[model samples]
Target: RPDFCLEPPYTGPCKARIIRYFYNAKAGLCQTFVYGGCRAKRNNFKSAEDCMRTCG
Candidate 1:
């Protein structure tokens, strides 16, 4: 399917996730963050590689 980027960037954190990732277009790579699940954006993923694979 697609990644979080399919939607818009949610700067605020979500609920609580072990590891969350989003695409950094400036860096052209996936960046990791402490995610808040319920409030995350489409760019959010469970792992760095998943972000890379989807929006990398």
Candidate 2:
């Protein structure tokens, strides 16, 4: 499994509040969250399917 799935959601420092998805290893599922436009982390995904594909 991808280790990034264990990472917590990071919104970064930008002001662009966009919808994003991240893997919740503890919960064993993908979750929706807000993301900053710039400086995206490895845990961030454009869609829940992508997140699940990589980390689910």
Candidate 3:
């Protein structure tokens, strides 16, 4: 078990989220947060265009 822990490919899944930042224009500041998986929801952008389209 100890040997396995030091083997190659030790890196785990590259699971990560994107933080979308845009001017609120109302609050006078930027907003962002950890994105969830590929799903249809609010405040979650799958692409730059989607983020810009909504945040724009």
Candidate 4:
């Protein structure tokens, strides 16, 4: 279980709920806990956008 401690942020259905969870705080600097699935860095989607798509 120790090795599996790491959990990907993206999961389940509702996406909007996930997006609202992560408050914008800038990349790297933002310590906000959020879904971690596809590379948001590549998509250039903000915290809101990322989750919006998931929720959409």
Q: Against the unseen true structure, what C-alpha lDDT does each candidate score? A: 0.67, 0.89, 0.40, 0.34
Please provide TM-scores, in order, for all candidate models, with all chains considered together. 0.63, 0.91, 0.31, 0.20
Model 1, stretches more than 4 Å misplaced? 1-18
lDDT-superior candidate, 1 or 4: 1
Which candidate tops lDDT?
2
* Candidate 2: Cα lDDT at 35: 90
For candidate 1, write residues 1-56 as lDDT tens digits. 35445454564654555566778777778777665557656787778787887885
lDDT of 4 at 7: 26
Q: What shift in Å separates residue 36 of candidate 3 from its native position after superposition?
A: 4.4
Q: How accurate is candidate 1 locally (lDDT)?
A: 0.67
| Candidate 3 lDDT | 0.40
- Per-candidate Cα RMSD to the true structure, in Å, reads 3.5, 0.8, 16.0, 12.1
* Per-residue lDDT of candidate 3, residues 1-56 (tens digit): 12221222211233455564433444533345454334423444345565455555
Candidate 4 residue-wise lDDT, 1-53, digit = tens: 12111322433443433332332223422223443444343222355555334
lDDT for model 4: 0.34
- Model 4, residue 14: displacement in angstroms? 1.8
Error of 2 at 32 (Å): 0.9
Winner by TM-score: 2
Count backbone overlaps in model 3.
0
